[PDB]
Swiss-Prot record, chain A:
One of its GO terms (molecular function) is structural constituent of ribosome. The modification N6-acetyllysine is found at K17, K58. Component of the 40S small ribosomal subunit. It comes from the Eukaryota. It is found in: Cytoplasm. This is Small ribosomal subunit protein uS10. It comes from Oryctolagus cuniculus. The lineage of its organism: Eukaryota, Metazoa, Chordata, Craniata, Vertebrata.
Swiss-Prot record, chain B:
Belongs to the universal ribosomal protein uS19 family. Keywords: Acetylation, Cytoplasm, Isopeptide bond, Ribonucleoprotein, Ribosomal protein, Ubl conjugation. There is a cross-link at K97 (Glycyl lysine isopeptide (Lys-Gly) (interchain with G-Cter in SUMO2)). It comes from Oryctolagus cuniculus (Rabbit). This is Small ribosomal subunit protein uS19. The keyword Ribonucleoprotein applies. The chain holds residues 12 to 130 of 145 of the full protein. The gene is RPS15. GO terms for biological process: positive regulation of signal transduction by p53 class mediator; ribosomal small subunit assembly; ribosomal small subunit export from nucleus; rRNA processing; translation.
Swiss-Prot record, chain D:
The keyword Hydrolase does not apply. One of its GO terms (cellular component) is cytosolic ribosome. Component of the small ribosomal subunit. The ribosome is a large ribonucleoprotein complex responsible for the synthesis of proteins in the cell. The modification Omega-N-methylarginine is found at R11. Binds 1 zinc ion per subunit. Its cofactor is Zn(2+). It comes from Oryctolagus cuniculus. The modification N6-acetyllysine is found at K47. Component of the 40S small ribosomal subunit. It comes from the Eukaryota. It is found in: Cytoplasm, Cytosol; Cytoplasm; Rough endoplasmic reticulum. This is Small ribosomal subunit protein uS14. One of its GO terms (biological process) is cytoplasmic translation. Zn(2+) binds at C20, C23, C38, C41.
UniProtKB/Swiss-Prot annotation, chain F:
Component of the small ribosomal subunit. The ribosome is a large ribonucleoprotein complex responsible for the synthesis of proteins in the cell. Has endonuclease activity and plays a role in repair of damaged DNA. Cleaves phosphodiester bonds of DNAs containing altered bases with broad specificity and cleaves supercoiled DNA more efficiently than relaxed DNA. Displays high binding affinity for 7,8-dihydro-8-oxoguanine (8-oxoG), a common DNA lesion caused by reactive oxygen species (ROS). Has also been shown to bind with similar affinity to intact and damaged DNA. The gene is RPS3. This is Small ribosomal subunit protein uS3. The modification Phosphothreonine is found at T23, T51. Methylation by PRMT1 is required for import into the nucleolus and for ribosome assembly.
Length: 100, 119, 68, 55, 96, 112, 66
RNA sequence: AGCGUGUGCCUACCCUACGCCGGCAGGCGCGGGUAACCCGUUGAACCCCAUUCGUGAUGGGGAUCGGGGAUUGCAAUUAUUC
RNA sequence: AGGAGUGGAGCCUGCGGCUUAAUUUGACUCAACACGGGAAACCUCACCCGGCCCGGACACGGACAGGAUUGACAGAUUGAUA
């Protein structure tokens, strides 16, 4: 009954659109919803030399890859969540539904 | 002159002694080396040097048994044997007097030629 | 380019024409006199024969040895 | 036998064990986050993986 | 490459029954990750399939470290002629 | 690795990229390319070859990955479509100057 | 007087097998003997001592420069 | 304090609390964490406070070198590292 | 205008030279010299001294099922239960 949706995405606006649709999907069906908890975004970092050889001035590229995690708690029966979460997802976002 | 000993132990006392008891006598590197377990890989070439160990012919100096093994321990069991330590190029004829115990056969070989300086 | 030592050759296989006749002895009647020992290993039942060397017996693929 | 010598030297650790998953070469490896991918390959495929230059 | 004949038959059965076969460029791989229980090394798969390639029965594409072998119409006829298969049955890429 | 493999395989077939949707039970992987009829093969032979490849390589289960091969709308503004276009014009034996003006003229008239 | 064996400058000696602190005139004698032992056996370590070089595995290219 | 990292595809190899043995390096049990969940409230150094020292190559400096003890590994000698 | 230095000392390290079986090698003003993500015990490794294997597709002509070829414990031999 306490069902915990984990929205993890690389993009923010796709993740904010999905978590906004899951608040509208929880408000229209009138089930009690703990708000989307913004988790601390993880910046995956790789700093390589630019040069494929060793013969320039030592320039470095610094590749970030931000991963944003939200999570939403619902007071909802199982099959109601199975219907909600299966509708209108966009491929940037990864959705993991925890039953209990 | 006097009867040489390792740590505080006579050579025949060293020689009729188990590996487990011989461990507690020499330095910690050689304890580690021989405690890891008996040697079954291409380290059963160590076990094949045990066969070359058990091939001392009657009364003279024995013939040279050659080794591409520089990580081999000079056991008291080995002492008296004539060994050819491989430099990578040449087998150096090395006898092992009983004060070599603990050390490795490879270190005794020069491996690298000494370096005089032209200019 | 030119090297010092003379070359090493490969082992040439000493191939035998009709090597099957040696393993058996034909009788005057329709029977046999099997010369060389049959392999007692589990892999090969009673079909595979052992080697008959000068001072011991040996089988090839199961790699089984019997000294006198 | 030859099968007892062909691959008998251990490949359990060191930069003679792991290699680039593209180049197949043994140098400048990005092991971080299980890329297992040499630094010139990563610099080619960064965009395709999701790595972006911002700051 | 000299192989046990049972291996080469197992490889050609697997190349036929599915319309494609893949493999990693790894000579030092004792078991092919698909054709596992029939104990084939990976180098026997590579060298069987590049023998199929040479005489123009299979098509070669190589990505990162993975060989990909598409079986072509001459290869279809060669394998059904080789393994003694019925011409009724098709590889899994000609069936919709 | 998907995008590299599909570049090396479907280059001459007018390749333009991938889009993979990781859905529950299925992988809705969509090849976006110019000639859909060239990539799909003969009655979807080369569709099913590529599904069987991706299945056997990446370790996806039996038919839990299925490929589509959709069409590039206004292919004059796709960069790698006009790169491979220019590539197979030069490799075909056409002169460098004529080919380059030919691509440049097309992508301008395309509305870039 | 209960000073442990882990605390002495000659632990598990090669000739007598005894844990003992060795002091000034004895230490100079025992250092001479340790170099003389490695010398006579013709070990790589004793040979590097004989040649007046770095023995504990340094690079002699740029340092040791007297 | 603040950035991070942390159990892998092939790939073995993670970060570690807590309890015992050992001076120490370290060992043996058992836990937690695939992570704002555990290590972690990251009890970091400099700094801060109180002893000893006393212008001396000195308790500055820690090179070189002897002897010993542990760990990683298939293997350390040309001293792996501690 | 100054601050902390570097250049002097020791050591770590890279380069030239010397040496060596080999001391693998690229780069030499800024824009070579803790740079090749290059902290190499093995692997890496390209260098040196030895010894295995074919992983020489396919096509053609011979050898060949009256067997073309695979592999193989001893004892030698070797570094090796190559």
């Amino acid at each position: 009954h306490r069902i915990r949706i984990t929205l993890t995405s690389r993009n923010v606006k796709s993740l904010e659109k999905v978590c906004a649709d899951l608040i509208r999907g929880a408000k229209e069906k009138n089930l009690k919803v703990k708000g989307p908890v913004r988790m601390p975004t993880k910046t995956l970092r790789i700093t390589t030399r630019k040069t494929p050889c060793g013969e320039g001035s030592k320039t470095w590229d610094r590749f970030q890859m931000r991963i944003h995690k939200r999570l939403i708690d619902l007071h909802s029966p199982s099959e109601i969540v199975k219907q909600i979460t299966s509708i209108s997802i966009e491929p940037g976002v990864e959705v993991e539904v925890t039953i209990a | 002159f006097r009867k040489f000993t390792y740590r505080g132990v006579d050579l025949d006392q060293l020689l009729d002694m188990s590996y487990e008891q011989l461990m507690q006598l020499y330095s910690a590197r050689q304890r580690r080396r021989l405690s890891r377990g008996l040697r079954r890989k291409q380290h059963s070439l160590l076990k094949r040097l045990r066969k070359a160990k058990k091939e001392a012919p009657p009364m003279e100096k024995p013939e040279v048994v050659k080794t591409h093994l520089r990580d081999m321990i000079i056991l008291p069991e080995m002492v008296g044997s004539m060994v050819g330590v491989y430099n990578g190029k040449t087998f150096n004829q090395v006898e092992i007097k009983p004060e070599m115990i603990g050390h490795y056969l490879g270190e005794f070989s020069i491996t690298y030629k000494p370096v005089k300086h032209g200019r | 380019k030119s090297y010092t030592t003379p070359k090493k050759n490969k082992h040439k296989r000493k191939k035998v024409k009709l090597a099957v006749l040696k393993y058996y002895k034909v009788d005057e009647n329709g029977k046999i006199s099997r010369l060389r020992r049959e392999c007692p290993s589990d892999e090969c039942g009673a079909g595979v024969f052992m080697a008959s060397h000068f001072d011991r017996h040996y089988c090839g693929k199961c790699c089984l040895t019997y000294c006198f | 036998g030859h099968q007892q010598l062909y691959w008998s030297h251990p490949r359990k650790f060191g930069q003679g064990s792991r290699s680039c998953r593209v180049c197949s070469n043994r140098h400048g490896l990005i092991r971080k986050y299980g890329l297992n991918m040499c630094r010139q390959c990563f610099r080619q495929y960064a965009k395709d993986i999701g790595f972006i230059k911002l700051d | 490459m000299l192989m046990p004949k049972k291996n080469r038959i197992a490889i050609y059965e697997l190349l036929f029954k599915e319309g494609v076969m893949v493999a990693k460029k790894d000579v030092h791989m004792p078991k092919h990750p698909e054709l596992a229980d029939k104990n084939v090394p990976n180098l026997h798969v590579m060298k069987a399939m590049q023998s199929l390639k040479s005489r123009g029965y299979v098509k070669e594409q190589f990505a990162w470290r993975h060989f990909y072998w598409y079986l072509t119409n001459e290869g279809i006829q060669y394998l059904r002629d080789y393994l003694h298969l019925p011409p009724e049955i098709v590889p899994a890429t000609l069936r919709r | 690795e998907l995008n590299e493999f599909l570049t090396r395989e479907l280059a001459e077939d007018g390749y333009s990229g991938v889009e993979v949707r990781v859905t529950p039970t299925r992988t809705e992987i969509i090849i976006l390319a110019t000639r859909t009829q060239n990539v799909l093969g003969e009655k979807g032979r080369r569709i099913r070859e590529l599904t069987a490849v991706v299945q056997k390589r990446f370790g996806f289960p039996e038919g839990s990955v299925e490929l589509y091969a959709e069409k590039v709308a206004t292919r004059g503004l796709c960069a790698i479509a006009q790169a491979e276009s220019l590539r197979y014009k030069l490799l075909g034996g056409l002169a460098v100057r004529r080919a380059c003006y030919g691509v440049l003229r097309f992508i301008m008239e395309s509305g870039a | 007087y209960k000073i442990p064996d882990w605390f002495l400058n000659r632990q598990k000696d090669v000739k007598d097998g005894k844990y003992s602190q060795v002091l000034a005139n004895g230490l100079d004698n025992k250092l001479r003997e340790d170099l003389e032992r490695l010398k006579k056996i013709r070990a790589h370590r004793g040979l590097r001592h004989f040649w007046g070089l770095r023995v504990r595995g340094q690079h002699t290219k740029t340092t040791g420069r007297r």
